[PDB]
From a paper:
The α-keto acid dehydrogenase complex family catalyzes the essential oxidative decarboxylation of α-keto acids to yield acyl-CoA and NADH. PDC, OGDC, and BCKDC are each comprised of multiple copies of a substrate-specific dihydrolipoamide acetyltransferase (E2p), dihydrolipoamide succinyltransferase (E2o), or dihydrolipoamide acyltransferase (E2b) inner catalytic (IC) core surrounded by multiple copies of the respective α-keto acid dehydrogenase (E1p, E1o, or E1b) and universal dihydrolipoamide dehydrogenase (E3) components. Here, we report the cryo-electron microscopy structures of the endogenous cubic 2-oxoglutarate dehydrogenase complex (OGDC) and icosahedral pyruvate dehydrogenase complex (PDC) cores from bovine kidney determined at resolutions of 3.5 Å and 3.8 Å, respectively. In addition, despite sharing a similar monomeric fold, OGDC and PDC E2 cores have distinct interdomain and intertrimer interactions, which suggests a means of modulating self-assembly to mitigate heterologous binding between mismatched E2 species.
After fitting and real-space refinement of the model into our cubic cryo-EM density map, the side chains for the E2o model fit the density well. The unambiguous identification of the cubic complex as OGDC is further reflected in the low presence of BCKDC components in the mass spectrometry data. For E2o, the backbones of residues 220–455 are fully traceable. The longer βC–βD turn in E2o enables an electrostatic interaction between the negatively charged surface of the turn and the positively charged surfaces of the N-terminus that is not present in E2p. Notably, in bovine E2o, the delocalized π-electron network is extended within the threefold axis and encompasses Phe253, Phe383, and Tyr419. In E2o, H2 has a length of 18 residues (Ser259–His276) and is comprised of a helix–kink–helix with the kink starting at residue 268. The H2 kink in E2o positions the C-terminal end of the helix more closely against H7* for hydrogen bonds between Lys275 and His276 with Asp454* and Asp454*, respectively. In contrast, the E2o knob has an additional hydrophobic surface on the opposite side of the knob, and the E2o socket contains two pockets to accommodate this difference. The exterior of the E2o socket is more charged than that of E2p, which leads to the greater number of hydrogen bonds at the E2o intertrimer interface. The E2o cryo-EM density map also contains a putative lipoyl moiety density.
Residue numbers in the entry:
A (entry chain F), B (entry chain E), C (entry chain D): 220 to 455
Amino acid sequence: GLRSEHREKMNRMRQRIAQRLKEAQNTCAMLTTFNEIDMSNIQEMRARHKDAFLKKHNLKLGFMSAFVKASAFALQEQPVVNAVIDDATKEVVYRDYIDISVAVATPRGLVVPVIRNVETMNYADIERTISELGEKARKNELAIEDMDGGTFTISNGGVFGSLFGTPIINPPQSAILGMHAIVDRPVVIGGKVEVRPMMYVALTYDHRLIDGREAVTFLRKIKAAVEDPRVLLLDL
Amino acid sequence: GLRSEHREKMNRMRQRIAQRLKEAQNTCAMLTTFNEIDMSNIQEMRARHKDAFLKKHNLKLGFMSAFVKASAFALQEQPVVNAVIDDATKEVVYRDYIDISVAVATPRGLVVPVIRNVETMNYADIERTISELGEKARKNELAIEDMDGGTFTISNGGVFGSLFGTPIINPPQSAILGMHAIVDRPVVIGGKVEVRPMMYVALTYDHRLIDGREAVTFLRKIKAAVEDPRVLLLDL
Amino acid sequence: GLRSEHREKMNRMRQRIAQRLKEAQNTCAMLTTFNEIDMSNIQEMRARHKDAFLKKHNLKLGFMSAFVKASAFALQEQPVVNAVIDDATKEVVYRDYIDISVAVATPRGLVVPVIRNVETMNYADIERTISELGEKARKNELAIEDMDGGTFTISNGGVFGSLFGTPIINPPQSAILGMHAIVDRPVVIGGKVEVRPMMYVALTYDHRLIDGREAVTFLRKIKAAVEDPRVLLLDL
């Protein structure tokens, strides 16, 4: 055999990132709750609205916008999940606005832009902002003010094939949604086993501020808004 | 868009609750292990003993009592899981008695009464105590001595539709059982795919005191006692 | 009812173990990601190569060696997962060698020997080392130098029937693989529901050093190497 232990020194900013990551766990009391979403409806919608959508808006219709809009609706329903707890003053600051940070992928790494005031956006606007920030961040010119102060987060581990896992809360928030890969699985529809494209979804919430019942109902609201997008119009 | 950050100050007791919650994680070394329970037998039992049980005892036959009794049996089998570790004296205090705290739901919130000395109770007694405490706590007159000093806990996230998640240990204990919603899922019975009502069950245990093998065997014991209630009579 | 709280004092070494266990969580930023592995191929291989393998090597062909070799291949593919982070000097020490610690079961308890330089071993060598250490540790004569300094770990909760759970990183490492019990489950093969022997696999990684994408790809690499062992020969 052989032995060798070459090494590299940790730079300043990576050390800062590690310290911040540990502070995130040492500040919040994190727990996770899982659920499954039937992705048939979104796939069926996009597989026929993609062509006309591409012609109209010069954009590709992914399913990220549906999740972003559903999460925005769920947050609007339950303000507490949109709030954050500040220990420096012993105050639970609420927020009337809602902006969401979505992770984008670059060969150099992954970064998290922010979508400002998502409550007034359609699917087209969300997709356009996502594409604009994904091409703007592909080149390194992404400034701090486009990454600062998200209230809620959506993490994408699905594109790499994970089944389900526990994400970690980005410091200045109270929750994070972690999506995962879509897999064909057998499910029971109307008392009969059937094959559908399903995906597990995991939510991590700060148990100090958000009760377990609140987190579970919030996740079920996201599920309801993603399975049948027409729920968004009914304000149901 | 618009921005507004109205806020509310955290009261004394909620701050104390948050501090206690963080102390719970900073004291124990928590891990989780999951399993699945086939709920066919309990449903079939209650769907035909409900009427005569209601006439005899003036009570509704839920499946909470079955889980409470099965957990009591499992705890009696493995004393270590019923013990707690005291850092203030460096002693692992065992307990010959067994009392279990079960979470009840109220519109104002959720609270956790205690069932004293569950080892000598039938299903009828457990159901009667649960109903009595659920109606007594519906009105606010629930005193401290009815909530102090549980050795083991059963958490109910199922009624809200969660699939599975990781609960957090109530401070003065070594484990907690978290039930979840019952869903019809395809399973393999005798080499053939079949549809049954299943439910995921999660156990969180303090890894300092309880070994992984012990936790897994304890969870399997609960599964065995809940799938086939006649195991309780055999002392098997 | 009755009450009694006899107790036993925690000895020195068990207290040290608990302190080390808590230090493990307070040092690393741990997260978990899960996946499922189709175990048909390994079962089919061993169910017909077992007899000739037993005659040739006087050994029983388990599936532990396949997992050990697949994990070694995955580690060799991604050096960062094999590295560890040292806070005492602010350096990320890499390792050109690879040794793996595998948990063995004894009636007195469970212990974790080490397999040195697994990158140059076949299935036969890994099985022989596992058997030798399992019989050597059955008797208490297992020295420290046979347990010190593993770079990666494989934990066995399957033999006790667990479905899936979150293991805890052994201090001087950056990841741990936790296997679980094999269960027959319905899966979709070529658009049609089918019954196969499956098993959930969980990876716990230190989020300070290993990115989520890296962990997910590493787990998928293990899955690819275990489902089709011929991937090992192709260096694919």
